[PDB]
Amino acid sequence: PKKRASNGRNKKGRGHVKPVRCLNCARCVPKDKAIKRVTIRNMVEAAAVRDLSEASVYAEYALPKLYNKLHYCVSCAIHARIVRVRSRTDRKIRTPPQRK
Amino acid sequence: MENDKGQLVELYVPRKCSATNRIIKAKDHASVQISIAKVDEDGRAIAGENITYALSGYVRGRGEADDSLNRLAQQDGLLKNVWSYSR
Amino acid sequence: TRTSVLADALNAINNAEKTGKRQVLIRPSSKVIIKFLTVMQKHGYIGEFEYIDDHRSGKIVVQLNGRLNKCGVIQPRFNVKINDIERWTDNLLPARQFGYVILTTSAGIMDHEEARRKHVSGKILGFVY
Amino acid sequence: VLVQDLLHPSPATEAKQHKLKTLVQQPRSFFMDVKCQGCLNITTVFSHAQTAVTCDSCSTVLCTPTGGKAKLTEGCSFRRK
Amino acid sequence: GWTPVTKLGRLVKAGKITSVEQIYLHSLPVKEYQIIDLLLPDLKDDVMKIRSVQKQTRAGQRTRMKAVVVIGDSNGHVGLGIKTAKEVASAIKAAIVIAKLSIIPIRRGYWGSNLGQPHSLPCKVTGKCGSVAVRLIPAPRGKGIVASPVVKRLMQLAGVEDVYTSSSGSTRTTENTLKAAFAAIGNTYSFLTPNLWAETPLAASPLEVYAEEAAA
Amino acid sequence: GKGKPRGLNSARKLRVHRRNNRWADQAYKARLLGTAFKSSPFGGSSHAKGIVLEKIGIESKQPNSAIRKCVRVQLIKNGKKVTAFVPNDGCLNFVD
Amino acid sequence: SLPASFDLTPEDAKLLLAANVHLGAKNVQVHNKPYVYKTRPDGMNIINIGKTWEKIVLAARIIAAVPNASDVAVCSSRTFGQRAVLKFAAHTGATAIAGRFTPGNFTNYITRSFKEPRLVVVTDPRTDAQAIKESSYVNIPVIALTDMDSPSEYVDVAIPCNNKGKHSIGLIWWLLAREVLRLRGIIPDRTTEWSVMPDLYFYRDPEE
Amino acid sequence: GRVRTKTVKRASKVLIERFYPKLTLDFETNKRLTSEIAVIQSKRLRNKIAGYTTHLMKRIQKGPVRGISFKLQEEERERKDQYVPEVSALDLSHTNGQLEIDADTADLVKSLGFKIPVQTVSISA
Amino acid sequence: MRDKWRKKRVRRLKRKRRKVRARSK
RNA sequence: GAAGAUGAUCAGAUACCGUCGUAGUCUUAACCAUAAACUAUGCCGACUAGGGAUCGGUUGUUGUUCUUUUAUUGACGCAAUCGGCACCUUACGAGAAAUCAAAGUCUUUGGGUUCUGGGGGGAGUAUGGUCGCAAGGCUGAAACUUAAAGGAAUUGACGGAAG
Ligand SMILES: [Mg+2]
Ligand SMILES: [Mg+2]
Ligand SMILES: [Mg+2]
Ligand SMILES: [Mg+2]
Ligand SMILES: [Mg+2]
Ligand SMILES: [Mg+2]
Ligand SMILES: [Mg+2]
Ligand SMILES: [Mg+2]
Ligand SMILES: [Mg+2]
Ligand SMILES: [Mg+2]
Ligand SMILES: [Mg+2]
Ligand SMILES: [Mg+2]
Ligand SMILES: [Mg+2]
Ligand SMILES: [Mg+2]
Ligand SMILES: [Mg+2]
Ligand SMILES: [Mg+2]
Ligand SMILES: [Mg+2]
Ligand SMILES: [Mg+2]
Ligand SMILES: [Mg+2]
Ligand SMILES: [Mg+2]
Ligand SMILES: [Zn+2]
Ligand SMILES: [Zn+2]
């Protein structure tokens, strides 16, 4: 039977969407279907932000962030636990998980 | 329903909804019968003397019961300028 | 496109009656619609109805009294001989004691009972009960 | 709403309807009497004019066509007929 | 010794309510089968089908018995009950109870002329359950119940003498066939006919005129 | 509109469509193609005589296990060879 | 019809307005549109308290028609209405259901608090959905205090008011109690000041 | 753990609903009392029941407990919640003597046949 | 077997049939 | 990066994995005409229920930012409306169910019209025709064989799935 009313993607009122490669395995996946995560990480881990600040020649120098947008196919994402199998009724919930 | 000789062969002439005129079935358990007391000129409720309306379970299920009572009660004088014919 | 204004009129009445509404708006109007409604009104299946002139085909507002179980058209309008009326009433009507098959005869639009009284037949047009 | 007056809609709700969706369709456009600033000469201009109308007296454009209602030029006053 | 637990039961234990039509006129819910026994003393039941259903478990199947019972007085009242139990005897005994609780009135009418007592249905009716749709057509006085043995038994216990039947779908699903026919036969008091157009005044409920006898 | 024409002058379309679609009914198809006349060993007859060629035992299908005792028969009317079961306990000894 | 003494008095209008009864929710459903007088420019909808008053008298008139006062069940799952319904039951003799409503109280006839009310009065159709749902199983009419966003399914008489107000709930319940007693004759007439004060029927925090 | 079971939790609260006036906050008195109120088959169960009844009794004295009603909890409560202040907190005396309704609401007041003094407040937000 | 490969096998077998018949044209 | 060559793994892998790699991938002139070419949902028309978003146009209006100092600036905000892409709730209603605002207004069976199916295989095969350079496309059986094949859902068992 039909598992999702959206067919597991985000294509409505459209014929074709150009693909993207999974970050992990380089599989061609449609752009609307790929699991996309925007990550803004500190370039230096919090353990090393102190000793690196002491070694700085600049007073009050802000460490730059690392900006990245990750694309995963369904297999890449499920295996890495980026997304998980949800119950039949919990699948419909499409609000971001309440973690942050 | 009656036979040729005129006897009422009908058992159970059923009730009809006051709002939609539908027949209220024997197992329509969402149907209610509102009983509204008559009030004398002293402001007292007259004992055992009521205005009665019946609503089918269909009308109540659609949420139209409230607006139907407003209309039905206004025609009988139970209400004033609460229900408007033109929307 | 719009191929039968009578079917649209009766479909609108059926949908309004099933939902408990006591009035329905019909567009467009026509002579056949008005004469079909007059037959329904004469037998008490509808109340007063209203014709609105808009310098076009027109509009109708019908008052419903909750007695109408179903009204419908028969497409196409089959030719009906007098001996064929019995077959149509058997298929379309719920019982032999009530309900009407509406015909268009050269004597005018009328129910199947009136058609038998004046011994006329035409094309079938619809039904009501 | 099961009971409702379809023949006498509320004039407030009647004015919000599309021009084709009233009981009897009626245009919402109108004609205006346009006074250019230079002189005083009645010039009838359609509200939704598609032409850059100029008054006869002085060759001055009264309105510029837009997507909907025409836009009257500065110094031009209109009065609905 | 039956001690009623409902307002309706108390009014029936006393002589306040004497017929089921007073129950039906106000759509009162019936929850005690002793009410039906008092008001409809002459009822005949029939075990139309007995089936075994199984729930697979870790050790093996868990078999239970499902019984379908049709109750009626052959004079315009008919009920239908379906109950599952570990044993056939308990399933049948419990299915009879809920068959009594579901007893509804039916409208008998006339095919053609109204000479004598009503013998058939007053109009064409249809009921649906699952894929099965059962249609009942009024029939003249000669034809008996033109129906399958499952539906025919339901017609006899309801008091219908003359009726045409036609079924569609998986009619061999006996439970769905009986539920569809039961729905169809109950629709006779749901179809508005011109002889019912007259407005009748709304009488007070028996729970109202006898409020103190139903108190506690 | 139910996917079929309803017009009063559409009898040809309705008649041709039914005629085209009865070929999906194998009972109708076999009757008009004359498959019994052409392909059936009996040629459409209910019975047919023949000469016994040999007595042969045929193993039954699973889950049954037995030797169904039949014969090889060449039909007189057309010379075709068919296998015919010989029914009952020990009736093979009546057939030579 | 009705004597003019049943009209909205200026005193009651002051009570209704001081209790913020007229403040209806931002979003109004289509069935509650007749009860809205005008939308306030912030977004709140103003309740036509003239209509609110008339529904109260109509609702109280239905309650007065029930012979046994205990056959009327007044319900409130909101904490703001629990004291009001408890005080309503004391004054009128109705049967209060404060706090949690046990599912099956109307349908399961072997439960402990299995009741058969002839009429159910509800503080809020949303938070008392279970009480309204079961009433639709045993032919029980429902009177509900409804806001402009309150659902109207299986609600026969809707009293347009603010369900989410601490003082609104108590006042509406207090107003019903006064009219039920006025119709019954407990209060001698419609002009005598009632002994009970609208502060009673108001929810009190555990602090006091 | 020392989690009491249901055979001791429900049997102890039946005692409170039935013999609250004769009970007390002392286990020793409760232990002797429950030996004459209930037929307990074993001494160990008697001590467990009396030991939990004492705990419930000790908890009732600190406030109302949920699930236990002993025909004196509400009798003390019916007239306990009778508090009403002298000022109505709804009477228009906390203000200057007139309603603080918004000007938009005042039109509704004007629509009705009322002449009520008002200090209009226009939040307009 | 998989329908796609079942289809490929028959195409290769149809291909052979055509070549064999062409010998005698 | 098909093919091919190669290093690993393996019992074997001319498979997965690694390194190279030819057609191909791009383009111009022509062919081919097929995809799970899918919303597996023909097209046209009418009606039946609530809600909030959003894109395009139009029409009325702000404690808002900005032109420029303000308007005839633009953006934003609030309302209506027509058209779209969709979505949320409910089920009057439909359905075998999954589910569906259409898959509803269908035994209370008829708004107009085109195409397609008739148990599973054999088989989209054989043959003939026709189109194509070919690959192949379109049209398209029968003999024979078979009691099920299949749809949706339930309980359990299992999983080199998650918690
Ligand atoms: Mg799957
Ligand atoms: Mg595609
Ligand atoms: Mg069949
Ligand atoms: Mg075919
Ligand atoms: Mg190798
Ligand atoms: Mg290789
Ligand atoms: Mg490479
Ligand atoms: Mg190329
Ligand atoms: Mg294809
Ligand atoms: Mg797709
Ligand atoms: Mg397709
Ligand atoms: Mg097409
Ligand atoms: Mg459409
Ligand atoms: Mg826009
Ligand atoms: Mg259904
Ligand atoms: Mg949906
Ligand atoms: Mg859809
Ligand atoms: Mg086939
Ligand atoms: Mg077998
Ligand atoms: Mg399956
Ligand atoms: Zn992959
Ligand atoms: Zn000029």
DSSP string, E142-198: S--EES-HHHHHHHHHHT--SEEEEEES-TT-HHHHHHHHHHHHHGGGTS--GGG-S
Alpha-carbon Rg of chain B, whole angstroms? 17
Picking from G199, G204, G207 by the largest number of H CB atoms within 10 A of its own CB, the best residue to mutate is: G199
Q: Which of E99, E167, E155, E102 is nearest to E130 (CA)?
A: E167
Distance between CA atoms of residues H92 and H96, nearest Å: 7
C1' nearest to CA of F30: which nucleotide? Answer: J142
Reduced to 3 DSSP states, what percent helix, strand and coil does chain H have, rounded to the nearest 5?
Answer: 45, 0, 50
C1' nearest to CA of C11: which nucleotide? Answer: J47
Q: Count how many residues are written for chain A.
A: 100
C1' nearest to CA of D74: which nucleotide? Answer: J72
What is the number of the ligand closest to the CA of F60?
19
| Residue E6 forms contact with G (CB below 8 Å) | yes
Burial class of residue C91, CB neighbours in 10 A (0-12, 13-18, 19+)? exposed
Let me know: does E167 contact E134? Beta carbons within 8 Å: yes
Distance between CA atoms of residues B51 and B55, nearest Å: 14
Picking from C22, C25, C67, C98 by the largest number of B CB atoms within 10 A of its own CB, the best residue to mutate is: C22
Strand G142-146 to G119-122 pairing:
parallel
Where on strand J do bases come within 7 A of a protein Cβ?
39-52, 57-60, 63, 72, 80-82, 84-89, 92, 95-100, 103-119, 123-127, 135-136, 142-144, 147, 151-153, 155-157, 161-163
Contacts of C33 (CB under 8 A, 6+ apart): C5, C6, C9, C26, C60
The residue of chain B with its CA nearest to that of E188 is B25
Distance between CA atoms of residues E77 and F29, nearest Å: 51
- C-chain residues near E124 (CB < 8 A): 94-95
- E-chain residues near C128 (CB < 8 A): none
Contacts of G68 (CB under 8 A, 6+ apart): E211, E212, E215, G118
Contacts of A77 (CB under 8 A, 6+ apart): A35, A83
Contacts of H67 (CB under 8 A, 6+ apart): H13
What are the tokens at E53? 């259903």
Distance between CA atoms of residues A47 and A42, nearest Å: 11
In Å, how far is B87's CA from the nearest CA of chain C?
13
Give the D window 11-70 contacts with C, CB below 8 Å: 23-25
What are the tokens at G35? 């009860």
What is the number of the ligand closest to the CA of F25?
18
A46-57 burial: b if 16+ Cβ within 10 Å, else e? eeeeeeeeeeee
A15-36 burial: b if 16+ Cβ within 10 Å, else e? eeeeebebbbeebebeebbbbe
Sign of CA dihedral G15, G19, G23, G29: negative
Amino acid at A57: V
Helix (H, G, I), strand (E, B) or coil at A39: strand
Picking from C68, C91, C97, C127 by the largest number of E CB atoms within 10 A of its own CB, the best residue to mutate is: C97
Distance between CA atoms of residues F72 and F82, nearest Å: 6
The contact set of G with B (CB < 8 A) is 1-3, 5-6, 31, 33-34, 50-51, 54-55, 58, 61-62, 64-66, 136-142, 146, 151-158, 182-185, 189-190
> Residue C55 C-alpha to ligand 15 middle, in angstroms?
45
C1' nearest to CA of A14: which nucleotide? Answer: J85
Distance between CA atoms of residues H61 and B59, nearest Å: 52
What are the tokens at C75? 């497409």
Question: Hey, are the CB atoms on B87 and D3 less than 8 Å from each other?
Answer: no
The secondary structure element, H or E, covering residue G5 is none
F10-29 burial: b if 16+ Cβ within 10 Å, else e? eeeeeeeeeeeeeeeeeeee
Question: Hey, are the CB atoms on B54 and E122 less than 8 Å from each other?
Answer: no
* Strands of B1-87, DSSP E: 32-39, 45-55
To 5 degrees, how large is the angle CA G178–CA G184–CA G188?
A: 70
Let me know: does D4 contact B86? Beta carbons within 8 Å: yes
Picking from B39, B66, B84, B85 by the largest number of G CB atoms within 10 A of its own CB, the best residue to mutate is: B66
* Backbone torsion region of residue G202, taken as left when φ is above 0, otherwise alpha when ψ lies between -120 and 50, otherwise beta: beta
Let me know: does H41 contact H5? Beta carbons within 8 Å: no
> Residue H44 C-alpha to ligand 2 middle, in angstroms?
77
Is there a cis peptide before residue G67, judged by omega within 30 degrees of 0?
Answer: no
C-alpha distances (whole Å) from D13 to each of B87, D6, D18, G24, H30 are 8, 12, 11, 22, 76
What are the tokens at D13? 């709700």
Q: Which of B16, B54, B6 is nearest to B32 (CA)?
A: B54
- G-chain residues near B24 (CB < 8 A): none
Distance between CA atoms of residues G126 and G151, nearest Å: 7
| Residue B26 forms contact with G (CB below 8 Å) | no
CB neighbourhood size of C55 (10 A): 7
Let me know: does G52 contact G159? Beta carbons within 8 Å: yes
CB neighbourhood size of D78 (10 A): 18
End-to-end alpha carbon distance in chain H: 59
Question: Hey, are the CB atoms on D25 and C22 less than 8 Å from each other?
Answer: no
Which of E27, E29, E207 faces G118 most closely, judged by CB atoms? Answer: E207
- E-chain residues near G109 (CB < 8 A): 5-6, 31
Let me know: does E79 contact E89? Beta carbons within 8 Å: no
Which of B11, B18, B25 faces E27 most closely, judged by CB atoms? Answer: B25
Is there a cis peptide before residue C28, judged by omega within 30 degrees of 0?
Answer: yes
End-to-end alpha carbon distance in chain G: 45
* Backbone torsion region of residue C110, taken as left when φ is above 0, otherwise alpha when ψ lies between -120 and 50, otherwise beta: beta
- Axis-axis angle for helices G10-18, G166-184 (nearest 10): 150
Amino acid at B24: I
* Strands of B3-78, DSSP E: 32-39, 45-55
The residue of chain B with its CA nearest to that of E25 is B14
> Residue E176 C-alpha to ligand 15 middle, in angstroms?
12
Burial class of residue E110, CB neighbours in 10 A (0-12, 13-18, 19+)? buried
Q: Tally B–E CB contacts below 8 A.
A: 82
- E-chain residues near C69 (CB < 8 A): 191-192
Q: Count how many residues are written for chain C.
A: 129
The residue of chain B with its CA nearest to that of C21 is B20
What is the number of the ligand closest to the CA of A24?
21
* Three-state SS sequence of C67-117: CCCCEEECCCCCECCHHHHHHHHHHHCCCCCCCEEEEEECCEEEEHHHHHH
Distance between CA atoms of residues C112 and C125, nearest Å: 10
Q: Do chains B and G touch (3 or more CB pairs under 8 A)?
A: yes
C1' nearest to CA of G153: which nucleotide? Answer: J90
Strand A65-72 to G72-76 pairing:
unpaired
Is there a cis peptide before residue F87, judged by omega within 30 degrees of 0?
Answer: no
Strand G45-47 to G36-39 pairing:
antiparallel
The residue of chain G with its CA nearest to that of B70 is G157
Contacts of D42 (CB under 8 A, 6+ apart): D33, D34
The residue of chain C with its CA nearest to that of E111 is C96
Contacts of G10 (CB under 8 A, 6+ apart): H114, H115, H116
> Residue A30 C-alpha to ligand 11 middle, in angstroms?
22
DSSP state of G191: S
In Å, how far is D27's CA from the nearest CA of chain C?
13
CB-side exposure of F38: number of CA atoms within 13 Å? 6
Distance between CA atoms of residues A82 and A35, nearest Å: 9
Helix (H, G, I), strand (E, B) or coil at D32: strand
The residue of chain F with its CA nearest to that of C74 is F6
End-to-end alpha carbon distance in chain B: 40
> Residue A8 C-alpha to ligand 10 middle, in angstroms?
10
Q: Residue F65 CA to nucleotide J142 C1', Å?
A: 34
Contacts of G6 (CB under 8 A, 6+ apart): B39, B43, G57, G190
Question: Hey, are the CB atoms on B15 and E202 less than 8 Å from each other?
Answer: yes
Question: Hey, are the CB atoms on B44 and G183 less than 8 Å from each other?
Answer: yes
Distance between CA atoms of residues A91 and D73, nearest Å: 58
C1' of nucleotide J152: residue with nearest CA: A1
Amino acid at E196: L
Distance between CA atoms of residues B55 and B38, nearest Å: 20
> Residue A87 C-alpha to ligand 17 middle, in angstroms?
23
C-alpha distances (whole Å) from G60 to each of B51, C65, G161, I7 are 14, 31, 15, 79
- Say what the resolution is, in angstroms: 2.3
Amino acid at D6: L
Q: Which of D53, D56, D57 is nearest to D73 (CA)?
A: D53
Residue ranges of D for the binding site for Zn(2+)? 36, 39, 55, 58
Residue ranges of A for the binding site? 27, 73
Question: Hey, are the CB atoms on G13 and H102 less than 8 Å from each other?
Answer: no
